[PDB]
Amino acid sequence: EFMLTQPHSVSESPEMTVTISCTGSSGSIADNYVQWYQQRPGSAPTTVIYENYQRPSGVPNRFSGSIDSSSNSASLTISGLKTEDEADYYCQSYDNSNVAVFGGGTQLTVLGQPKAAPSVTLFPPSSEELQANKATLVCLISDFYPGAVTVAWKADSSPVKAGVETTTPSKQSNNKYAASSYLSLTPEQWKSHRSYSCQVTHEGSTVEKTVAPTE
Amino acid sequence: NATTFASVYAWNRKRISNCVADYSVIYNFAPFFAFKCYGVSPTKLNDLCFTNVYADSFVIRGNEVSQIAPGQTGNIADYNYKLPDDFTGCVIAWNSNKLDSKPSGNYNYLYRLLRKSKLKPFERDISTEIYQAGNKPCNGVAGPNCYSPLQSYGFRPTYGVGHQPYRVVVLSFELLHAPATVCGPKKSTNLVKNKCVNFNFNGLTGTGVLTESNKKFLPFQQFGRDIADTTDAVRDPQTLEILDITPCS
Amino acid sequence: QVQLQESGPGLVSPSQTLSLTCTVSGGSIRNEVYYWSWIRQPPGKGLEWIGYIHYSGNTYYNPSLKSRVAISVDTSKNQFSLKLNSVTAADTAVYYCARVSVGGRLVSTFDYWGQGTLVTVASASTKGPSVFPLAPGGTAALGCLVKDYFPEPVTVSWNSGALTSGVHTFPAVLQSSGLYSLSSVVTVPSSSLGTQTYICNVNHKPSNTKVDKR
Amino acid sequence: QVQLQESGPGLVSPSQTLSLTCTVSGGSIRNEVYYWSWIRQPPGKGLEWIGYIHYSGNTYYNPSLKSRVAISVDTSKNQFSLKLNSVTAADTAVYYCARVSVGGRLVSTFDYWGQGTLVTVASASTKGPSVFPLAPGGTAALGCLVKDYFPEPVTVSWNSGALTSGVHTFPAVLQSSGLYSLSSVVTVPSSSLGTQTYICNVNHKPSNTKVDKR
Ligand SMILES: *[C@@H]1O[C@H](CO)[C@@H](O)[C@H](O)[C@H]1NC(C)=O
């Protein structure tokens, strides 16, 4: 057994020197070649460093690995980090019995992202769903910078008693966040009220839509 | 199916003779990395017959498979195993990383690094004499101008495919002067009596009707003939019974 | 470029034998990389190595999953499959197949990876897909809603993949009733709300059920 | 295919008889090309045609070298020899034997040649060279030094003729005392400096002396 340990999360300002370390526990690191892979959310990992010193084509020169036999650990130092490199990293090695082992992973985060306002969007249930004796509200959030954004629902007088679902925000293609919310209820209760609203909690601000079921 | 194969410098050879050379049982093993045949054809190898088959078994290190061939030159080809310029046979090789490798390193296999002269075809030379690189003697231990004759392989399971241990079996098929004895299987359809069919018992080609008779031959006799030198009866080599040979009509 | 395509049933009942098929495109497995491995990743967790197979019959498995993992290969179809017997809820992970380069001195270089797929290890209250339209300045937003479907892996499409400008997706969520829900919208000008009706072409991968609705 | 191989001593004393023997492999000289010629080339100079001989004994020589060149053939051994008496210091050249495709319409088509051997005409008669190995970023380099020898042709093999990737050779130079020096290195990884000793193999053809050092 040759297990590798990595820090779970890490963050650093852009255009600075960042180094991701990965340490072995039950084996010699100099016995096999350590590989690093970049895996963005919703995509397959891509080879970054192989043979511990070689880098394939297409990868920027900012990536560079290192091997330390004294501390039986490896370190992936970066020069000039930026937003396009915000992804997960893993150290992959091999045990003495030809067994490949992947690292615990390292969540890289870029703090120097530009500030943006959330794009709150709410959609009421259509008539095709109301005819099916059901109703479901779809609230959409996007383009927001803070990741601690929570959701809320109001019936313009009190919180909605119906079921409420909450989704965890995730990164977009442009390093921004995106989230969604859902609420299900009967069509009779939906058509018998004046308005429903989807409240979004943002840093120092809040946005609501207040869509009215009355046609 | 051997559990342990000898090293390349000390390759063990087995003689195959006086048996049914059914080469089809070889394909039941793992997919062969190399099956190059010289002179003989593997498609109809069972159809031909040979005198003796030399099975040279040894293990080499990956890319060294390309060195075992008639007319090649290399470290293994010149100092560990040399094939003749007119070799007639097949070279079978397959990977054995899951058997001949250990995590701590399987240093049980060794090979001769060099010698004063090249090896003759099918020559074996096992010794521990320290090689004398310089004019000074090399008795006792290998000094600065001396080197050990044998070198050990690593054979770790983490090495690349070019360095993995490959078991190689070289089969020879040269007929020197003796008549051939190992031809392989020659199965055919069963007997059909009371009907005129062509027969080829042990090479006795003809046409006639086979029928049982009380003409029991001697234990060493195979077939019978009349006063006209014509075959009249023959025995069935599967179940020993005398069957007469007469023209149908 | 060499591309891989995972395949197999997206929903497997518990205590059953899991089976997934990986298709190799761009050549044949004789001399290319000599190794093809499987890697799984639980949702929100790290990667996990499973094992690779050689075309000569050499197989290697994870020590933690020796008796459960079974790997086979077929050189005639250029496809290698991964088998897992007696699956449970702990096996919930997205499986990937990848090639391993052994031409060097040591094994390394996981150069290419597949598209990946998720396998549902639950069969309780299995239901099919269901869709419902969503009602919608110079621009407006609207899309199609998919609900009442038990299997997690689902695919979306718009206008048969022709001119998909403004298409955006959102992560799914499991409702309290035991069914997932997915939403996909598209940004279009306000003039195109009543003219040039766009069609959403979501597809339920575990059942290959294509549904088209405005 | 049919190829040629030169043989004979590479160092001849002045005013002596030069003797060289060319060996043909496979094709016996009765019907193959009917003609086999000798061609010598001084260092850095043009090709000097010497002469060819027919299988029936029809010999031909160069006009400038008619009084010294004597060519013979031995069909029993598929070998033909070249004799050059009264050699001079200016006769330093690398000799080659090649065949002529006269079987066509006219004499032409020097299709196949030999590897050639360097022949030095001097009364030095120096013995074999003294060798000294040179023991050793991600890659390193090591070599073996060869000095103190008048006859140039020597072998520069490595690892008993294996792993030739990265091997490089350098031209020789004559010292002030009258000896040549040779150097050749090979690029090796820095991590592999502990095992797999890269032996350098040298052989002095004029004396058949072989030395192997790490
Ligand atoms: C013969 O080969 C089979 C696999 O084909 C193997 O399981 C068995 O152990 C081999 N026999 C011996 C004696 O090793």
Short mmCIF file of N, CA, C and O in Angstrom, two decimals, chain D residues 85-153:
data_model
loop_
_atom_site.label_atom_id
_atom_site.label_comp_id
_atom_site.label_asym_id
_atom_site.label_seq_id
_atom_site.Cartn_x
_atom_site.Cartn_y
_atom_site.Cartn_z
N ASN D 85 51.61 -3.20 -55.65
CA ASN D 85 53.01 -3.21 -55.25
C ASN D 85 53.61 -1.81 -55.38
O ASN D 85 53.09 -0.94 -56.09
N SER D 86 54.73 -1.61 -54.68
CA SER D 86 55.46 -0.34 -54.69
C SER D 86 54.55 0.82 -54.26
O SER D 86 54.37 1.80 -54.99
N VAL D 87 53.98 0.69 -53.06
CA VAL D 87 53.09 1.73 -52.55
C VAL D 87 53.90 2.93 -52.10
O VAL D 87 55.09 2.83 -51.75
N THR D 88 53.26 4.10 -52.10
CA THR D 88 53.89 5.34 -51.69
C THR D 88 53.06 5.98 -50.58
O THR D 88 51.96 5.52 -50.26
N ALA D 89 53.60 7.06 -50.01
CA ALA D 89 52.90 7.75 -48.93
C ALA D 89 51.63 8.42 -49.43
O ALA D 89 50.66 8.58 -48.67
N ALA D 90 51.60 8.81 -50.70
CA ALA D 90 50.43 9.47 -51.26
C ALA D 90 49.29 8.49 -51.53
O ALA D 90 48.19 8.92 -51.89
N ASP D 91 49.53 7.19 -51.38
CA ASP D 91 48.52 6.18 -51.65
C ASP D 91 47.54 5.99 -50.49
O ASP D 91 46.78 5.01 -50.51
N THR D 92 47.54 6.87 -49.50
CA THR D 92 46.60 6.76 -48.39
C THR D 92 45.18 7.01 -48.88
O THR D 92 44.85 8.12 -49.30
N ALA D 93 44.35 5.98 -48.82
CA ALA D 93 42.98 6.07 -49.29
C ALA D 93 42.17 4.92 -48.70
O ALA D 93 42.72 3.92 -48.25
N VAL D 94 40.85 5.09 -48.71
CA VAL D 94 39.93 4.06 -48.26
C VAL D 94 39.46 3.28 -49.48
O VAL D 94 38.87 3.85 -50.40
N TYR D 95 39.72 1.97 -49.48
CA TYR D 95 39.42 1.12 -50.62
C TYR D 95 38.02 0.52 -50.49
O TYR D 95 37.59 0.15 -49.40
N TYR D 96 37.33 0.44 -51.62
CA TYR D 96 35.99 -0.14 -51.70
C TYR D 96 35.92 -1.08 -52.88
O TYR D 96 36.57 -0.86 -53.91
N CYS D 97 35.14 -2.14 -52.73
CA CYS D 97 34.83 -3.05 -53.83
C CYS D 97 33.34 -2.97 -54.15
O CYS D 97 32.50 -3.00 -53.24
N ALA D 98 33.02 -2.88 -55.44
CA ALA D 98 31.65 -2.76 -55.89
C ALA D 98 31.47 -3.56 -57.17
O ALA D 98 32.43 -3.84 -57.88
N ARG D 99 30.22 -3.93 -57.45
CA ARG D 99 29.89 -4.69 -58.64
C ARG D 99 29.35 -3.77 -59.73
O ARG D 99 28.88 -2.66 -59.47
N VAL D 100 29.43 -4.25 -60.97
CA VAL D 100 28.97 -3.51 -62.14
C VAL D 100 27.91 -4.34 -62.85
O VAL D 100 28.14 -5.52 -63.16
N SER D 101 26.76 -3.73 -63.12
CA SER D 101 25.67 -4.41 -63.82
C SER D 101 25.87 -4.44 -65.33
O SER D 101 25.06 -3.90 -66.08
N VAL D 102 26.95 -5.08 -65.79
CA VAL D 102 27.23 -5.16 -67.22
C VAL D 102 26.28 -6.09 -67.96
O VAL D 102 26.23 -6.05 -69.19
N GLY D 103 25.51 -6.90 -67.23
CA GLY D 103 24.56 -7.81 -67.86
C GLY D 103 23.50 -7.14 -68.71
O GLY D 103 22.79 -7.83 -69.44
N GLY D 104 23.38 -5.82 -68.63
CA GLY D 104 22.43 -5.07 -69.43
C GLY D 104 22.93 -4.82 -70.84
O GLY D 104 23.51 -5.70 -71.48
N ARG D 105 22.69 -3.61 -71.33
CA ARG D 105 23.10 -3.26 -72.68
C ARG D 105 24.58 -2.89 -72.74
O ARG D 105 25.32 -3.40 -73.58
N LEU D 106 25.01 -2.00 -71.85
CA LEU D 106 26.41 -1.58 -71.80
C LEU D 106 26.87 -1.55 -70.35
O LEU D 106 26.11 -1.80 -69.42
N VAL D 107 28.16 -1.23 -70.17
CA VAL D 107 28.74 -1.17 -68.84
C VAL D 107 28.22 0.06 -68.11
O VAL D 107 28.47 1.19 -68.53
N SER D 108 27.50 -0.17 -67.01
CA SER D 108 26.96 0.92 -66.21
C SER D 108 26.44 0.36 -64.90
O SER D 108 26.70 -0.80 -64.55
N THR D 109 25.72 1.21 -64.16
CA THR D 109 24.96 0.80 -62.98
C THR D 109 25.83 0.18 -61.89
O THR D 109 25.77 -1.02 -61.64
N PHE D 110 26.67 1.00 -61.25
CA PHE D 110 27.36 0.57 -60.04
C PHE D 110 26.35 0.55 -58.89
O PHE D 110 26.28 1.49 -58.09
N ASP D 111 25.57 -0.54 -58.80
CA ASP D 111 24.42 -0.56 -57.90
C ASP D 111 24.80 -0.85 -56.45
O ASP D 111 24.32 -0.15 -55.55
N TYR D 112 25.64 -1.85 -56.20
CA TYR D 112 25.95 -2.26 -54.84
C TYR D 112 27.42 -2.02 -54.53
O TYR D 112 28.29 -2.31 -55.35
N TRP D 113 27.68 -1.49 -53.33
CA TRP D 113 29.02 -1.21 -52.87
C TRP D 113 29.26 -1.91 -51.54
O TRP D 113 28.35 -2.48 -50.94
N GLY D 114 30.51 -1.86 -51.08
CA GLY D 114 30.86 -2.42 -49.80
C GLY D 114 30.99 -1.36 -48.72
O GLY D 114 30.85 -0.16 -48.95
N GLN D 115 31.28 -1.82 -47.50
CA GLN D 115 31.46 -0.92 -46.37
C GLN D 115 32.80 -0.20 -46.39
O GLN D 115 32.89 0.92 -45.88
N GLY D 116 33.83 -0.81 -46.96
CA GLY D 116 35.12 -0.17 -47.09
C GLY D 116 35.96 -0.26 -45.82
O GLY D 116 35.45 -0.35 -44.71
N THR D 117 37.27 -0.23 -46.02
CA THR D 117 38.23 -0.25 -44.93
C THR D 117 39.34 0.76 -45.23
O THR D 117 39.76 0.90 -46.38
N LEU D 118 39.79 1.46 -44.19
CA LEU D 118 40.83 2.46 -44.35
C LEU D 118 42.20 1.78 -44.34
O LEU D 118 42.50 0.98 -43.45
N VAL D 119 43.02 2.11 -45.33
CA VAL D 119 44.35 1.54 -45.48
C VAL D 119 45.36 2.68 -45.38
O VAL D 119 45.34 3.60 -46.20
N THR D 120 46.24 2.60 -44.39
CA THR D 120 47.28 3.60 -44.17
C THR D 120 48.62 3.04 -44.62
O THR D 120 48.98 1.91 -44.28
N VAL D 121 49.36 3.84 -45.39
CA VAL D 121 50.66 3.43 -45.90
C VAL D 121 51.76 4.20 -45.18
O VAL D 121 52.12 5.31 -45.58
N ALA D 122 52.30 3.61 -44.12
CA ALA D 122 53.36 4.23 -43.33
C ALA D 122 54.11 3.16 -42.56
O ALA D 122 53.58 2.07 -42.31
N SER D 123 55.35 3.48 -42.18
CA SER D 123 56.18 2.56 -41.43
C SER D 123 56.12 2.79 -39.93
O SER D 123 57.09 2.49 -39.23
N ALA D 124 55.00 3.31 -39.41
CA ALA D 124 54.90 3.55 -37.98
C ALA D 124 54.78 2.25 -37.20
O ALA D 124 55.53 2.01 -36.25
N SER D 125 53.83 1.39 -37.58
CA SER D 125 53.56 0.10 -36.94
C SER D 125 53.26 0.24 -35.46
O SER D 125 53.71 -0.59 -34.66
N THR D 126 52.50 1.26 -35.06
CA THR D 126 52.17 1.45 -33.66
C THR D 126 51.18 0.39 -33.20
O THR D 126 50.33 -0.06 -33.97
N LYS D 127 51.28 -0.01 -31.93
CA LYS D 127 50.42 -1.05 -31.40
C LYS D 127 49.04 -0.48 -31.05
O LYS D 127 48.69 0.64 -31.41
N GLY D 128 48.26 -1.30 -30.35
CA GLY D 128 46.90 -0.95 -30.00
C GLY D 128 46.80 0.29 -29.13
O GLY D 128 47.77 0.73 -28.50
N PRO D 129 45.61 0.89 -29.08
CA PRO D 129 45.43 2.11 -28.31
C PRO D 129 45.20 1.83 -26.83
O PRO D 129 44.80 0.73 -26.43
N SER D 130 45.45 2.85 -26.02
CA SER D 130 45.11 2.81 -24.61
C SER D 130 43.78 3.52 -24.38
O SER D 130 43.56 4.64 -24.84
N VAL D 131 42.89 2.85 -23.65
CA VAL D 131 41.53 3.34 -23.45
C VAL D 131 41.36 3.74 -21.99
O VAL D 131 41.97 3.15 -21.09
N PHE D 132 40.52 4.75 -21.76
CA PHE D 132 40.21 5.24 -20.43
C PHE D 132 38.77 5.73 -20.40
O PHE D 132 38.43 6.69 -21.11
N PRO D 133 37.90 5.10 -19.62
CA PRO D 133 36.50 5.53 -19.57
C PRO D 133 36.34 6.82 -18.78
O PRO D 133 37.20 7.20 -17.98
N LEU D 134 35.23 7.49 -19.03
CA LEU D 134 34.89 8.75 -18.36
C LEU D 134 33.60 8.54 -17.56
O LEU D 134 32.50 8.65 -18.09
N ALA D 135 33.76 8.23 -16.27
CA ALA D 135 32.61 8.00 -15.42
C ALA D 135 31.84 9.30 -15.20
O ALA D 135 32.44 10.37 -15.03
N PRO D 136 30.50 9.24 -15.19
CA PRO D 136 29.66 10.43 -14.98
C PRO D 136 29.68 10.91 -13.54
O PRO D 136 29.80 10.09 -12.63
N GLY D 137 20.59 18.24 -13.97
CA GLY D 137 19.49 18.00 -14.88
C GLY D 137 18.97 16.58 -14.83
O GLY D 137 19.51 15.73 -14.12
N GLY D 138 17.91 16.31 -15.60
CA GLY D 138 17.33 14.98 -15.63
C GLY D 138 18.13 13.97 -16.42
O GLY D 138 17.92 12.77 -16.25
N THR D 139 19.05 14.43 -17.26
CA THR D 139 19.87 13.55 -18.08
C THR D 139 21.34 13.86 -17.84
O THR D 139 21.71 14.98 -17.48
N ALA D 140 22.18 12.84 -18.03
CA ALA D 140 23.62 12.97 -17.86
C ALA D 140 24.31 12.45 -19.11
O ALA D 140 23.67 12.12 -20.11
N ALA D 141 25.64 12.39 -19.06
CA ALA D 141 26.42 11.92 -20.19
C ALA D 141 27.73 11.32 -19.69
O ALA D 141 28.30 11.77 -18.70
N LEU D 142 28.19 10.29 -20.40
CA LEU D 142 29.45 9.63 -20.10
C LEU D 142 30.04 9.09 -21.39
O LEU D 142 29.33 8.85 -22.37
N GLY D 143 31.36 8.90 -21.38
CA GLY D 143 32.06 8.43 -22.56
C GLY D 143 33.30 7.63 -22.18
O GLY D 143 33.54 7.34 -21.01
N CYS D 144 34.08 7.29 -23.21
CA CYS D 144 35.32 6.56 -23.05
C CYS D 144 36.36 7.11 -24.01
O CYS D 144 36.08 7.31 -25.20
N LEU D 145 37.56 7.37 -23.50
CA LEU D 145 38.63 8.01 -24.25
C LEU D 145 39.53 6.97 -24.88
O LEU D 145 39.84 5.94 -24.26
N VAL D 146 39.96 7.23 -26.11
CA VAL D 146 40.85 6.35 -26.86
C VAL D 146 41.98 7.20 -27.43
O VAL D 146 41.74 8.16 -28.16
N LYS D 147 43.22 6.84 -27.09
CA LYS D 147 44.38 7.60 -27.52
C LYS D 147 45.54 6.66 -27.82
O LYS D 147 45.43 5.44 -27.66
N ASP D 148 46.65 7.25 -28.26
CA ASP D 148 47.91 6.54 -28.48
C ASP D 148 47.77 5.39 -29.48
O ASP D 148 47.97 4.23 -29.12
N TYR D 149 47.45 5.71 -30.73
CA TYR D 149 47.37 4.71 -31.78
C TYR D 149 47.45 5.39 -33.14
O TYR D 149 46.75 6.37 -33.41
N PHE D 150 48.33 4.87 -33.99
CA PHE D 150 48.51 5.40 -35.34
C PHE D 150 47.44 4.90 -36.31
O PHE D 150 46.87 5.71 -37.04
N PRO D 151 47.13 3.60 -36.37
CA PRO D 151 46.06 3.15 -37.28
C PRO D 151 44.70 3.62 -36.77
O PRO D 151 44.35 3.40 -35.61
N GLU D 152 43.94 4.25 -37.66
CA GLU D 152 42.69 4.88 -37.24
C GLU D 152 41.53 3.91 -37.01
O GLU D 152 40.88 4.03 -35.96
N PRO D 153 41.22 2.97 -37.91
CA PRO D 153 39.97 2.20 -37.76
C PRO D 153 39.91 1.42 -36.45
O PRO D 153 40.69 0.50 -36.22
#
